[PDB]
Design a protein around this ligand. Structure first.
Ligand SMILES: COc1[nH]nc2ncc(NC(=O)c3c(F)ccc(NC(=O)c4cccc(C(C)(C)C#N)c4)c3F)cc12
Length: 265
């Protein structure tokens, strides 16, 4: 098939924020959309390989909890268009406006997110950057996973969600399904404590270092009083410092659809 969206069809609008490659604008193309572009006119053959990669990946995804890729554009500048999500990122809800979710909606946001990663994984896609910033609550329900980049709030990197092996840079390709599972674990941790990990440490390098040596890990004793003992039990199985001791998502997903089935009281 062809998803090439011809020249002049897209109508760029308000500037939303900086995207992986160029900048993300909220535009129009048969309804509101997001357009991520390249600001410079020069296609670095090392950048185009990336655009031609991102488009290559979104194209494989088609599911309620992954952001909807709707089409790409090569004509002036290179762009990738996704549906426009009305709402905020989970990171925004949790840590900025400090929204207070009830345990049910929480478990659910958790369950959708898991539901989502599962799909990406079944399609043999590693996300490599799952985190509350990249989890979008479209219309306040319906988790939408994507890699929004620097659009959405807040050489560097996002340290908190990296599993140790990653934070080390062991064998040049540290990333795995279990990589994601950890990132998911920290997300669980966020949902269950409304906080980010290691808030009492104000030194990035030390966080990187210790989380790497396995001297530091999330303080699980901060889980909200009413959290189900199985959510907490799962949280840890996901944040295991040993790559191979972590659960993959088909199990994670089920462990959730189980604990979510028994707690309306
Ligand atoms: C403030 O920013 C915003 N508010 N509302 C918005 N609505 C949409 C957008 N939209 C985006 O930020 C956006 C966009 F406009 C175009 C492409 C991608 N790319 C991806 O989502 C992506 C890239 C690589 C891999 C993957 C996944 C994880 C699926 C894989 N594999 C996804 C985007 F995230 C921004 C918005």
């Amino acid at each position: 098939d062809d998803w090439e969206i011809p020249d002049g069809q897209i109508t760029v609008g308000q500037r939303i924020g900086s995207g992986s490659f160029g900048t993300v604008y909220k535009g129009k193309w048969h309804g509101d959309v997001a357009v991520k572009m390249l600001n410079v006119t020069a296609p670095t053959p090392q950048q185009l390989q990336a655009f031609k990669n991102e488009v290559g990946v979104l194209r494989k995804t088609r599911h309620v909890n992954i952001l909807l890729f709707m089409g790409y554009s090569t004509k002036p500048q290179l762009a990738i268009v996704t549906q426009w999500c009305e709402g905020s990122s989970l990171y925004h809800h949790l840590h900025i406006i400090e929204t207070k979710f009830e345990m049910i909606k929480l478990i659910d946001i958790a369950r959708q997110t898991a539901q989502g990663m599962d799909y990406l994984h079944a399609k043999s896609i590693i996300h490599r950057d799952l985190k509350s910033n990249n989890i979008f609550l479209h219309e306040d329900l319906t988790v939408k996973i994507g890699d929004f980049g620097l659009a959405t709030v807040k050489l560097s990197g996002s340290i908190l969600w990296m599993a140790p092996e990653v934070i080390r840079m062991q064998d040049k390709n540290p990333y795995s399904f279990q990589s994601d599972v950890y990132a998911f674990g920290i997300v669980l941790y966020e949902l269950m404590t409304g906080q980010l990990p290691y808030s009492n440490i104000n030194n990035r390098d030390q966080i990187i270092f210790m989380v790497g040596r396995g001297y530091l890990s999330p303080d699980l004793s901060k889980v909200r009083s009413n959290c189900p003992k199985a959510m907490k039990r799962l949280m840890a199985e996901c944040l295991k410092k040993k790559r191979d001791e972590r659960p993959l998502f088909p199990q994670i997903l089920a462990s959730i659809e189980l604990l979510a089935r028994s707690l309306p009281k």
